[PDB]
Every structure is written in C-alpha cells, then in structure tokens.
Ligand binder design. Structure first.
Ligand SMILES: N[C@H]1CCCN([P@@](N)(=O)NS(=O)(=O)O)C1=O
Ligand SMILES: N[C@H]1CCCN([P@@](N)(=O)NS(=O)(=O)O)C1=O
Lengths: 838, 845
C-alpha cells in the first residue's frame, strides 16, 4: 500500500521564517461622458484605488479614448484627483463610529472607502481625516488635468458627521448624521440645520434610546443596510410663499427595550468597554417607524424652516406584523416613498408605496394633529404592490426598479428579483393596480388581512431555471428604458462564475452573456449603456480590470458586442511558489451535487498519503468554491500545501448560489447536515485522489467554520484527529435576532435545534486526550463575542476536558494586523506539526 | 547520578489523582470557630463561669452561624472537655439564594478574602446583649445575656424592616445607646432606632443621579484602594459617648465619617460574574501616578428625645478645609475616637507613604455645613482660639510606612494638657515594637475665621515621655487582625509577636507601668492566633504546626492576683481537636541558610515521596516572593497548599524560599526591593534552589519549573526572563506584567510614581521584556481569572499582545468565573490537572 508522508519538523523561528517568507484593484466606478467632439476622450472614469506607490485608497480618474489600436493593449493611466492628501487619520486609528462601520462593511483598506457623486454639478462628497471634504470636477468648472486640494466642510457640531449624502434635487445641500439625529447643511453658505430631535443628549446614554436616520446593529450586521435615511430625488412647492421643499425619508428607532452588552474597546490600556444595543435571538428588536423630514429654502439657499412628519396613523397600527425595514427609497418622480418590510420570522416580505401626503406634521397639540389627519385626502393610502411568502426564509434582494407612471395611470410597473416563487432568484416584470379604497385618516382603525394589497394585473418571468440572478452584497441591475433592456449578473453558465447578462423586459426571450467564460466577473455599467468595467479572475489567474465598449448597430441593442477597449489593471504574475487549488464536484448518497477544492501537496509523488486540513466555513450566505483567484485571501492554504499538507474545501448544503432549497437544508438544525456533507466530501476526495491520509485530518475554520470545527470533533471524533476552532459560535442563544431567527427560529420554538447546534452544551463529547483542540478568538469581537469562547472554556472546565487557547487582544471578528496574522499562521503550522502527526 | 522520571498518566488518570487527593484529603476546609466574645455569667449557683459566642460551621451545616459554648467553673485535669457547639439561631439560612451575593457584598467578600457562606461578622453590645448582623440580603438582630437572661435553646432572629432601596451595608450598634445603629445606603450614612423602627439619613453626598459617573461623592465608605491596599473596610466611626448641648432635654450622638469625591479618579470596566449578561461593573481604579479620591473627615450629629425619636440632624465640616489644614495628606489609613469622646483621631499618610501623622480632632473644630457665607463666617468666628488639631505622633522613614492598627489612648483627666497612649512603631528601630508615649497638648491660639496656611510642624506636640515596652530584632504583630488587649487594672498589655522565632506567632504579656519581663503565654513548636477575654481571665488559641492540623483550645489564666504578669495559662477545654495528619500527607521540612551577603533566609522542601538515594528529581520552585507575605513558617500548609504534597507524591521536589521583600523579618529585610521589584527576589530564589540542591542532593537543576500566582506569577516570568538556563519552564498565574497598570496604594509604596522611577518600572514590567522570553514552545504557561478586579485580566491580555508582536509562543488557560483566586472546586481541580500535565510533558527532556 501507500507510504505515509511526514511533514518536515521546524523550530518555532523556522516556522516564523516560512510564514514571513510566504508573505514576501480599482472600484466604486462613475462613468461621465465628455461632450467636446475635438478632444480625444469619450469619457472620464472616476473610481477609488490604491496604486502601488500609495499606502491608502484615494479618488482617481482615467481618460477613455474615442479610438484604440486593434493590434495593441492600452493600459489606462491612473490620475490622482487629490494633491498629496492623507485621508487616513493618524496611525489608522478611526473614531469608534467609523471603526465599527468599517467592521460592518468588511473594509480593511485605509483612506477614502466611499464617496457620494452628483453628476450634473460634478460634486464629490466624502469622509477623510476625522472630517468631511468635497471637490468638484466636470459640470460647469470643467475637467482637472492635475490633482487639486479638497476643501474641508467646517461645522459647529460635536462628534463625527456620519453617512454624508448630496441632495439630488439641489447639490448646494448635503445631509449627515450627528449624535443619532439627521442634519442638513448648505455646502456653499456653510449654514447647518438639525432636522430631527430624537437624541435629547442626556448624561445617561441608556435614558436616551431614540435615533433618526441610523441603521442599528442588526440592520448593519445581518441585513447589509448601513443607512437609515433616503433623499427624495425631487423638490416640491407646497404653500403660498413659493419656498422650495426638500424631503428625506428616515427610520426612527427606539432601542429602550433592546438588551445592552459591553465589548472591550481597542484602546486596551484604558481598560474600558463600548455599550451595544445587541438584540440576542428571542429578545426585543428596536421599535421602528418611517418618518419624513422636510426643510424649506429660498432663492438665496437659506434654510427658512424644518419639519418632522409622521404617519397619520402609527406605523405599528398600519403595519402591525412588520419587525424590520430591509430597504427603502423613492420612485424617481418623488411621488411615492417605498419600503421593503419583513415580519419577525422573516418568511413574509411586503413592498409598500407611501405617498408623502400620508405623513402629517408631528405636534404635542392634539387639535392641530386631528386637523392635519382630517385634511389627508380619502384617496391617499399605503399600496402593498408586492408580497413574497415562503416556508424557508426571505433573503433580502436589493433589485426593485419602479418604471415612471403616465399622468392619470392607476398602476405601477416594476422589475423585482423574487426567489420564493420558484426557489431560485429571478427577474419579474410586475404591474400592480393602485386603487383607492377611501379612508377617514382622523378615525383610528385596525387594518384587516391584505388591507392595502394591490391586485397584480401582470407578472412576467424575464429569467427562469436552476440558476440565480445575483441581487445581494453589491449586485444590482441596470435598466435602459430607451432599448427596454435590463442588464443583470447571474450563475446561468455555472454556479462557479458570476457573469453579466442582458434580456429585454418588453419582449422577454434570449439572454445574451456579455462577459468572458472561464472567469468570475464583478461588473459596473455606464448609466449611458455605452461602456462597462469588469473586475474578474479565475482559480489560475489573478484579478484584472478591463473596460468594454458596447458596439454594433443601434437597431439591434440586445446583440451589442462587448468590445475589449482598454485595461485598468493587468493580472499580476502568478507566483512560482503559488499552485492554484483544483475544483471538483461529486454526487452525495442523496444525489445532491456538491463542489469542492483540493490544494494538492506541492511536488506530489505517487503512492503517498498526506496529512490533510479540511478548511471549513459551511454557513449560509457564503460560497468558498468558485472559479475566482484564491491566492490573495487564502495564501495560507497554499503555504500548508507547500509543506505537504493536502487542503480540502467542501461547499455543503447551506452554502449559497445554489438556490433556496439547497441552503434551506439547515433550517432549524444548524450544524447537523453541514458535517455530514463535509465528511462525504473528505471521503470522496480520499477515494478520487488517493493522496489523503484519513488517519491525519485536521478540521479548521473561523466563525461558522469554528462552530463546525467543534461540531466535527464532537460528532465525528474518529474522522477528525484535531480541531482548530477560530471565533466559534458555541451557544446560538447568545447570537443576534436577524441572523439566528432566520435560520433557527426563536429558542422557545426550536429548543431541540438550539440545544443540538450549541457545541458548548456538548463538551462531554469533546476529547479526554490533550492536544486535539485549539481555540482562537479576537478579544474585541463585537459580532461573535469573546463570551462564546469564555462560555466554552467554562463548560470545558466543568466537564474536566483539556483545551489550548490563543487570544488576539487587539482583533475583532477578523485578524487585520499583519504581525498577528503571521503569529496565527505560525501557531497553526506548529499545532499541525506537533499534534496532526502520530 | 540517575535522573528520576515521573510516571506519565492519561489526562483522566491525572483527574483521578487530583480528585482523590482532595476528596480523601483527611482534612476539612473552613472548620475553625472564630470571632470570639467571652461574657461572664452572674449566677454563683450555676456550673458555668462564662458563655463564649463565636461564628462557626458545625458538622451537619453548609454555612457559618452564630454559636455559643458554656465554659464550666471546674474541669477534670486528667480529662479532655470537648465544648458542645449550641446554635443561637433556630433553622435560619443566612446565605442568599444559590450563594449569589449583591455586587457590593460580593466585592466586600473579595477585599476581605471571605470564602465561607452565611454570617461572616456580627456587632455585639455586651451591656445590652444585642447582636447585629447581615443575613439573607437584609439586617437581623437577636438578644442574649444582660437583662433578657441566657437562652437554653435556639431563638428566631428578628429582621429589621426598612423603607430604604438597595442594601444596608456596614451596620454598627451605637456604643453610647444600643437603641440606635448605623448603616450605609446608596453611598450615604443612615441611623435607625432598632426598638421603634424609625430610620433617618444623616449625609446627602449621593444625589442618586441616573448617570452614576456624574454622582461621584460618598460618605462613610472605604474606596477601592483603601479596602484592597490599606485593609480598611469602613469609612465611619461612632463617637462612644453622648453629649447634652442645646436648650431642650435632647441627647446628641456623633459619627466621624470620611467624605470622598472620586470625580477625577480613572474609571475601568471589569466583567461581571453573570457571564451570560455580557456586562461589566465600573470601578474608580486609581492606577499608579493618577489621581486618588479627594478626601475629608466630617462629623454627622443627631439629637434624640426621651422616647428615642430622632428630632434633628446636622452635617458638620472642618472650620478650614481638610486640604488647607492637612495639605500633604493623600490617605486616611485609620480613624476613631478617644474612649471619653473628647477627640476624634485619624492616621494620615502622605502620597509617598513615608510620613504618617496621628492627629486628634476635637468636635468643636467642626462647624455646620452651609451655602450661607454670613452663617459660615459667624460659625468660624465662634470656634474657640484654643481649639485645634494635635499631631500627637509622627512616623518618618526612607523605606515605607506599614499601617499598624495598634493605637490605645488612655482617657485624659479633666484639665490635663497631655495624652498618654500605646503605639506600635516600626520606623523608629526598623522592627515593629510597643511604645508608651506621653504628648503635651497646648494651644497658643488660632483665629479660624482667617485664611489658614500651616507651617512646618504646625500642630506638632512635644513628646514628654516615650517608653519602649518591647525591643530587639523581632516584631509585635500589628496588621491583618493582630491587636493588643490592655488591662488597666493590672497595667498589663497582651500582644502577639515573633520574639521566640520568626517561624511562630506567640501570645506575650508585658507591664506598660514598669516595662521589664515579657512572659510567653503560648506553647512553643506551634504558631498561635489568639483571642483574649475582655476580663483577662481566659483566652482562645487557634494553633497549628507544619506536621499538625489546626486545633482551637480555651485556656484559663490562673495564679495569685498580686502577681498578674506571671498568671499561668492552664488548658481548660477544646473548641476543635486537630484532625489526624493524613497518611498520604507528608509535611514539608523547614530549613535556613545564609546567602553570600550573609542574610539568613528560611525555606521549606517537600521531598519526593519514597525517595531513593543517588536519584535527581524534577523540581518545582513554588514562589510568591512579594511584600506582606511569609510562606515559610511553622503552621499547617496542607489546607491551602495540598497540591505541593500532591506534586511530591508523583516524585517532584517542591522548594519554597522566603527571599528579601517577604515579611515578619523587619523593615530593612522587606525594604531590599524598594524601587526595584523583580531584581533582588529572583537572586534569592536561585541561591535558595542552589543551596537545597547542594544540601539535599536530589534536585535535578536541568529540570526546574518556577510557578506562582499574582506576585508569584510576576516572579515566574522574571525567572524565565533573567535566568533562562536555571528555569526550564514557567507557570505564571494572574501575573502583574506592567506596574503602570496596578494601583496607587500598593505600587507607589514599593516603587514610587512612574515619573520618579522610570528605570525601576521599566525593569520590573515583564510585558516590556517579552523579547527575552523563550523562542521555544512549551516553556511558558499563563493562567488568569477572567473576572480579576485586583490584577486585571488586562495584565495577561497585554503580555499576550507583546508576545504576538515579538513572535513568541505561549500557552494560556483562563478561569472565566474566577476573580483574583480560584474558589470553585471544579476550576481548582482543572488548574491542578493542567499543572500536572504541563510538568509531565514539558519539564521532562
Ligand atoms: N453576521 C454573519 C453574516 C454572514 C457572514 N458572517 P462572517 N462570520 O463570515 N463575516 S466575516 O467578516 O467573517 O466574513 C457573519 O458574521
Ligand atoms: N493588593 C495586594 C495586597 C497584598 C496581597 N495581595 P494578594 N495577591 O496576595 N491577594 S490574595 O488574595 O492572593 O491573598 C494583593 O493583591
């Protein structure tokens, strides 16, 4: 039979030398057309980027030429917008507000990480150096040819100005959040005005529990929403004085009843915590309402008045089953505000139109409030234009595109991504009928079943089949109303690649792929539908960023050619010591297709079985196995393979980009099906490849992966010789409402699932042998609290079980510091060297 | 010579060894009765001379209760009387539900090192026979002796009803009138009438604001550093006498209290023991070099009528601010009253803790607190010219002041301008000794309405006489419960000391009239903890040796009344017989040697069990090595240090050395570590280890582990840093890793402020020397209680941060539910199993 390969033993400092030795793209695109026929450029393309000489992200541009040589590859020059400007604060130490927002968004890079852009005026608005800055380019002032100094926006406000946005109707104005309230300011005059008065500014913060315009913890962490306010895109002219009204839809929250937890602050020497309103599963979420903030401006841009407006009947009366606002915004004409509402079980979503006339001025005067309520026209109401229901869960999809209405039309046509209908996320063209029932809004009423529900006149599937339109985590559609085409991203070719597609929403038929097969693409489309960018890679090829021109006859828009135009970034040379993993698939005993990757031992010899690391995440919303470059994020897996470890990765049931039924397998039973699929995958790899030593398998993962590493050691102790569990969830009753309830229900409704899935309650089944269990955790983790590890250790002590522990005192949910990253990898190599070998 | 190899066990094998060692220890923890009060019986016919009251956990109970035993007038000389433990309280549970105390009571128990459940203290008023104590999240009382007579069976204790919100802490009976008691509620001083139920708030420092950090004043409360570093758990003191000033038949009662303002004190967060709530408690933690609380002594007065109704109250403050009168005072160590109530007194320390003043404060120096400037000026002008503070004693040193509790003022004659007192003083000779001091109290007059700036030696009293009652190169014990008993009829002072040997505490008596012969009252070959009857006819000794578990014996002082100094201690009865020395337990052997500098150091050795000649054994150097502790003495170590016997039973040699810095050897000996903590301690540990190896011949110097907790964890790391060829492995429990993160009271005493001793702080902070820790794995195990509010988990967290930056390996264990010490048996067992496993795998080659 096969010989058993022995990894070379190194000293601790030898392992440090291996790790240190081993560690020896433009984004956020805005296309602007140039309208000078004499000049050689069709567009200026703006973006964020860190070029190789820079140590932070800054605002950059490249010039797109009208003509390119067919025989040559143009590499576009990256031009600086800002002149020798440091956007990063001193020592990369952000305010707590900016630091936590960077954690919620998974932003690791320093400098400008987002900007707001107003195309007509050419205004850029962004956070930098613990303040707000702006610059102008294009519009009236024209296009810069060397970097300019950005202008700081002065304030009399105390503490950070968060979530800055330009007023779409009038770019003289921008909005921001300060001390949990919504403000506006005139960028030209410097005038600032507070719009909302939720935050009293009391000495005891726990007595001051309301905010306006703020996405709370669970909304940011579990619903991917980082804003609590939405500019109305249009101005209005109500009243006799001729003042211009500007409007902001905002979420008001009351966190009074939300549980408070303390997490250590990153300034360790101060030995203090930050307080979080952390809704643990089964406990109270914030009380929420949508409100309308208005202010009026004169011809000189002076802010003459402000008004808080609220729903004529309470949010809780109109929409009694709503737990969460997933998303909100406006129709392009500003005729309707809209909101995406979820029930607490997250099995029922409503898309609701809210006309501004349904909101009345807030007042303590009961007679004035009654007068305002009585004056609301009878034909004004909410319209539930769409409803999604499932026995699995609603994934929040960002795709909702309302078409403009004609005058006197009692219908709304819109594009909607819908997963629950077929179990795969697809594009539908929906026509809802908006008919007024007639309501006396001064008279309180409890709405009945389907009270505001709109009849659906038409619902056309634009896409169908066992593949997904991508509608989450930055994915969007682009709609050309001139050509009646919708551009979208999807897995139609393969679940291993993201591609750009186009289909008609008028005459739904042929879907045209616009991206190159054999790569996974992240695309940005011009609002003029003339050009697009793709950031793309493969398992073998590092990322490149290419600009494409949509070319061909204007009478055949569906079959426009994606013509390669220029490169923004050529693929880096694949290092000689880097060997890409190999993708495979197999069918389980239940005949489900699973995909996996194998990092083959480097310089592999036949007839030899190698010690193996099963690298696991295995949780919802993640797919580890796809045809994209893994060497930037997962270099440590190549390093393991270079020492002669085989590394196996399996996307089991519960993982994403395979439809709702596939991820639905773990419903109310997290931990159970995932480990079965991991073991089937490992055993398939051993049978297919023949270089896996099944007597020497380590299971290793972080967060959900740490949870499954422990589940593996508990339930399959003959399969897994050692577990290395990073930031593990050890008790589901300690995780939050938004995530845990979606997949597991509330604890009272799923006692068996919570008990079976909580590894800290099964410590009696963990090994009675030392050196089979290494626990790792960031001390400052505000997501999977250090509590999870602390509670697991308390249980290990009670059960008389041995454990090894490493803490990252300066790290939250991920290891960001390179020295801590290296120490983690050295520790992993040492643990495997000493304890995976017999 | 052959190398002994310890038998390798499985993890579950080690669990069975540790579980067996503790379950079948042959000893009981928290067994001894304590807090003794002797009361004479007044029945000449009856068979008992005294009732003896105490706290004790009787066999067939899981908590401390209030107990008594009857002391017979006659005992048989040839028989051993075992006193029957009688319950005072009828089937009463004093422990709260699931042994979960309020945060206030829990932290007080941590400061006091109280592990036992139930009644942990009582206040007793002997004349009235009133007992006052905390139990079951409330206040209870009972009565026995005096007028009510002596109970023959247990009685139900009476709860004291309140309309206060939150705990009533630090309850005390009014000495002048036992109808009244005091307590602290929400950081303010209250009094109550126990007979009528009437309650009255005296101080109004605590506003009760929603934001606690905007509410930084307390009255009657000892703050964190005072409790943790000065062994003071109260911030108020009853005046022992009533007065009758004013214009009605009203009686005035008085309480001296410390008012503190913690506004400028740094706030830190420590995790709460309810881990599932994921919250912290806020502490006003003065780190070394940062602000201590602003402090003042004030006087609370109230008047009572003939019905015991509280008619009126007054807050009074010093006529000139505390900060003006006493500008160099950082800390109030101690306070109280003269027995006649004529003076309040305070023990003041400067911030360097090198200057102590004993200061008398007459009540007339305190005036009513007021916002009305005209009323305040009138009050200040009315203070008599001859009223002033008196500095009756001053202690100065170039080492540090240890706070000694022994101050006994003799009551003054009317019109006497002198005060006589007994005082324990260490700084005079470098050894703690008893002095009879006479100070002259004369005033040359002050205008208290005029703004005040004290000169050098303002208020300083001439010393007429200072008699040394004790002398030599040994100590009177004056700290951590040690006290004197003064019989004014016989002119004798009873005290404890190290006169016979630094290895044993003994009870002594000497005359304070004609200072001469010191008589020892306790048996040599044991260390004694004694309680004396207030009638000086009987005493209790709680005593043990290295070889004999503790017993508690009652002794009668007998002989001719005309020769009180030579009264003979006669064994009378047993409160608790010594358990048999367990067959599996082998006592350690005490030795001494002289260093190369000719300092005598004491040590102990646990020999490997069933030792064979010509065999070198792996060795554990068990270390504390910090100030205020002596590990090596002739007392039983098997209750607290059973794990050292367990190590010896597997064939480890265990060595303990009391190096320079350790206590019970005088100020010069402990003063060696001044401004250089870490440096001399390791030199003495290594000399001790090397002496033991040369003398005993069974030490394998190639296989030595260093292990300690707290200061011992600090020294374990210092050993591995500075002597990496001596120490193969270090196991550091709850280590201090950065002195700049420890508190004012302790750190500044031994090290000065960071700004004045940058080199000492740098050299003594092991977290700043991680580059010198081993680059090899399995040489360093760190252990820490997650909830430690003393040596914060931060010390370990910061050490780990530095280890990561330096690219060093480490092993780590946390005790999620433990503070500064491991109290839970499951955690204690897990710690010992982990230690055995670490030594088994990594001390062997
Ligand atoms: N709240 C969840 C959302 C799904 C992904 N994750 P993580 N653990 O994968 N984030 S990450 O920053 O580790 O990628 C979560 O924590
Ligand atoms: N603040 C000091 C006072 C002196 C003794 N100690 P420890 N470390 O000996 N505590 S103990 O509870 O272990 O006895 C201190 O922490």
């Amino acid at each position: 039979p096969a010989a058993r390969f022995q990894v070379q033993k190194h000293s601790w400092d030898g392992l440090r030398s291996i790790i240190h030795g081993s560690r020896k793209a433009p984004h956020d695109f805005q296309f602007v057309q140039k309208t000078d026929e004499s000049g050689p450029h069709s567009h200026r393309l703006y973006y964020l980027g860190m070029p190789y000489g820079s140590r932070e992200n800054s605002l950059l541009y490249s010039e797109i030429p009208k003509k390119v040589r067919k025989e040559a590859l143009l590499l576009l020059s990256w031009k600086q917008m800002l002149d020798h400007f440091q956007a990063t604060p001193h020592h990369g130490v952000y305010s707590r507000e900016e630091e936590l927002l960077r954690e919620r968004k998974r932003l690791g890079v320093f400098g400008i990480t987002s900007y707001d852009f107003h195309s007509e005026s050419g205004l850029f608005l962004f956070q930098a150096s613990n303040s707000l800055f702006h610059c102008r380019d294009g519009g009236k002032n024209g296009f810069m040819v060397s970097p300019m100094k950005p202008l700081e926006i002065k304030t009399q406000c105390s503490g950070p100005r968060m979530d800055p946005k330009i007023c779409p109707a009038d770019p003289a104005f921008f909005s921001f959040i300060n001390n949990s309230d919504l403000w506006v300011a005139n960028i030209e005059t410097g005038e600032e005005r507070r719009l909302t008065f939720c935050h009293q500014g009391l000495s005891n913060v726990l007595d001051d529990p309301k905010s306006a315009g703020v996405a709370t913890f669970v909304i940011q962490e579990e619903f991917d929403r980082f804003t609590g306010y939405w500019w109305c895109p249009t101005a209005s002219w109500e009243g006799s004085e001729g003042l211009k009204t500007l409007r902001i839809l905002y979420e008001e929250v009351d966190e009074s009843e939300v549980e408070v937890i303390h997490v250590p602050s990153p300034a360790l020497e101060e030995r203090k915590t930050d307080s979080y309103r952390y809704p643990r599963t089964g406990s109270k979420n914030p009380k929420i309402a949508l409100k309308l903030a208005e202010f009026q401006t004169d011809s000189q841009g002076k802010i003459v008045s402000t008004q808080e407006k609220e729903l004529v009947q309470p949010f809780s009366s109109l929409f009694p089953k709503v737990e969460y606002i997933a998303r909100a915004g406006w129709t392009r004409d500003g005729k309707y505000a809209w909101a995406m509402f979820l029930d607490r079980p997250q099995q029922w979503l409503q898309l609701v139109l809210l006309p501004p006339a349904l909101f009345i001025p807030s007042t303590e005067n009961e007679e004035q409030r009654l007068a305002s309520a009585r004056a609301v026209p009878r034909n004004v109401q909410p319209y539930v234009v769409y409803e999604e229901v499932t026995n699995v869960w609603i994934n929040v999809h960002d795709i909702f595109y309302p078409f403009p209405q004609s005058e006197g039309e009692d219908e709304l046509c819109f594009l909607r991504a819908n997963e629950c209908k077929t179990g795969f996320c697809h594009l539908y063209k929906v026509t809802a009928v908006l008919k007024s029932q007639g309501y006396d809004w001064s008279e309180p009423f409890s709405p009945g079943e389907d009270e505001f529900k709109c009849p659906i006149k038409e619902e056309i599937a634009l896409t169908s089949g066992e593949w997904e339109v991508l509608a989450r985590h930055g994915s969007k559609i682009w709609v050309n109303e001139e050509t009646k085409l919708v551009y979208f991203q999807g897995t139609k070719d393969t679940p291993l690649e993201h591609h750009l597609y186009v289909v008609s929403y008028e005459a739904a038929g042929e879907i045209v792929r616009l991206t190159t097969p054999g790569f996974s693409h992240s695309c940005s489309m011009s609002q003029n539908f003339d050009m697009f960018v793709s950031h793309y890679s493969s398992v073998s090829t590092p990322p490149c960023v290419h600009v494409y021109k949509l070319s061909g006859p204007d009478d055949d828009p569906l079959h426009k050619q994606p013509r390669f135009w220029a490169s923004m970034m050529e693929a880096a040379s694949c290092p000689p010591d880097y060997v890409p993993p190999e993708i495979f698939h197999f069918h389980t005993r239940s005949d489900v297709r699973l995909y996996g990757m194998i990092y083959k031992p480097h310089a592999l010899q036949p007839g030899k079985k190698h010690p193996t690391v099963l690298f696991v995440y295995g949780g919802p919303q993640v797919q580890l196995v796809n045809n994209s470059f893994k060497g930037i994020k997962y270099l440590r897996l190549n390093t393991l393979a270079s020492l002669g470890y085989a590394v196996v990765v399996i996307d089991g049931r519960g993982s994403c980009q395979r439809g709702l039924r596939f991820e639905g397998a773990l419903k109310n039973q997290m931990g159970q099906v995932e480990i079965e699929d991991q073991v089937e995958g490992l055993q398939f790899v051993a049978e297919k490849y023949g270089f896996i030593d099944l007597s020497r398998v380590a299971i290793h993962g972080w967060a959900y992966g740490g949870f499954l590493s422990l589940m593996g050691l508990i339930h399959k102790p003959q399969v897994f010789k050692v577990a290395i569990a990073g930031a593990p969830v050890t008790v589901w009753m300690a995780y939050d409402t938004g995530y845990t309830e979606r997949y597991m229900d509330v604890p009272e409704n799923n006692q068996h699932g919570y008990e079976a899935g909580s590894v800290a309650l099964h410590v009696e089944k963990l090994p009675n042998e030392p050196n089979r269990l290494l626990i790792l955790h960031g001390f400052l983790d505000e997501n999977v609290h250090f509590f999870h590890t602390n509670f697991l250790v308390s249980q290990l002590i009670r059960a008389g079980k041995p454990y090894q522990l490493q803490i990252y005192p300066n790290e939250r949910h991920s290891i960001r510091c390179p020295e801590s990253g290296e120490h983690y990898e050295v520790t992993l190599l040492h643990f495997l060297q000493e304890y995976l070998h017999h």
